[PDB]
Amino acid sequence: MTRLTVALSGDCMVTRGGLITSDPAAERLRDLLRGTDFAVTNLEVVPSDGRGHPVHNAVGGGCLIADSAVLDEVTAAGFSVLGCANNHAMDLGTEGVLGTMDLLRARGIPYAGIGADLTGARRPVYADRPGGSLALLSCTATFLPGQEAADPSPELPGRPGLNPLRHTATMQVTADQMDVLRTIDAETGLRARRAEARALLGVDPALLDRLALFGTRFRTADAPGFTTECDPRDLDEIARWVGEARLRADLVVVSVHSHEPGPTPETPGEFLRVFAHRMIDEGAHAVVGHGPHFLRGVELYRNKPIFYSLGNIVSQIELTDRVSAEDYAKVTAERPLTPGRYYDRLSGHGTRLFAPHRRYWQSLVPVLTFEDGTLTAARLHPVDLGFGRPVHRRGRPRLADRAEAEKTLTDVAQLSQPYGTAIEVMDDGTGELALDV
């Protein structure tokens, strides 16, 4: 009956024009994206005509702001539905995110994940085509506290911001380790400095056999360990909107931004896996993840795919022309710096950060085919971002050649093996997931 194709991708950190080069492998990527019914990416950059003020985002790597003309590069390349909840959408504050919504709506680009209040950030966006409709929901587990949007009260408006997926981490420690922690709390004088809060609240907010010291949760356990768990409010609220989107579109896609690592850098946080299973339990047809800037595994759960990380589809951080004063201060200089010189110094003249490692310059574009909601095909198109090229050329995407596509498909297979995922490989280096249907 209804047959729809969806292209997925990761972080779109675009800061310059000419996104699709004259390379035939790059033009074939645009042809691939244009040929689908819907093409989703995560706008990991603030398009701006000047509205707002830079926030201090040292932990996110600095501000990521670009001329709003980059939005024409995104649409001309083939992307048609935008997820905006990430740790950079608020780089220009509440006024910046209101400016982003204005820019996207004036260009007729559907988006989700940000809004003038919390409900607007949580809502799905519905993209309608002659062949059918797709609902996109977008959330992020990585952001500066306070950047989440807020809903209005009877007396005050809401707050523009992002759709949050909060989570808590608990340290499991032995009883003897717990006793030393409380000993350190008492003997340093730290417990004495909570005496006022004890009188005002009536309780010591550090005794919960839980315990909250140094802004971290500790719990007595038989063996040391580390746990993560999604905020119940965010999980139930996002799931609520997923069930709503299921009634009003053929396909529901949940895009989640998450930098958080599991026990290993390539594994997702345990909470993120619980989140993705819940989204499919509620009716989502796919979960697309991003954040780490490298690829993570792919899981098939109840015959629906979870892409824990598609990495970067566009990577032009080092080419941004808008560096904030607080960002400049992170580099000690004997003379005022130009942006390119600042990024060269920040990376130690290229010897650290993302440039030296190949994992940050390989990507993947899945193309999913659905027939009345059933996944019938999941093609995998490896993407090359130009590792080792000059800074002004690396970061633009093109379909990887045969040899490098095969290495990328091998990585994906190895990263997805713990989930029982198998891949068929074509002669050109592209592949597809082995499905049970």
Partner: peptide, 9 residues
């Protein structure tokens, strides 16, 4: 806002 990973560049 990046508790145990420290870096989320």
């Amino acid at each position: 806002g990046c508790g145990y990973a420290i870096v989320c560049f």
